[PDB]
């Protein structure tokens, strides 16, 4: 678990699913997504504060772009 890379837990469709909440997605993206990722995509700080202004489709966009530029640690 010491420097374990983020293997996506959920797929694009699983995220878009209104069954799956926005909070645990933002948790995943702030859990390993570094400071520049969190600043540009505004996923830093209090999850709920982000979640009240986070739309699901933006979170799936942020998710896909995370791995695309390796912005995670």
At 10, which CATH number?
1.10.720.80
**Sequence-ordered list of residues with C-beta below 8 angstroms from that of 69, at least 6 positions apart, any chain:** none
Q: Compute φ and ψ for 12, nearest 5 degrees.
A: -55, -45
Residue 56 to residues 4, 10, 15, Cα–Cα distance (Å): 26, 13, 7
Method: NMR
Domain membership of residue 61 as a residue range: 1-73
The number of domains in the chain is 1
Query: Measured between alpha carbons, how far apart are the two ends of the chain, in Å?
Result: 12
């Amino acid at each position: 678990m010491a420097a374990a890379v983020p293997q996506r837990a959920w797929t694009v469709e699983q995220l878009r699913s209104e069954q799956l909440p926005k909070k645990d997605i933002i948790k995943f993206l702030q859990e390993h997504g570094s400071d520049s990722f969190l600043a540009e995509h505004k996923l830093l700080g209090n999850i709920k504060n982000v979640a009240k202004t986070a739309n699901k489709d933006h979170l799936v966009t942020a998710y896909n772009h995370l791995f695309e530029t390796k912005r995670f640690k």
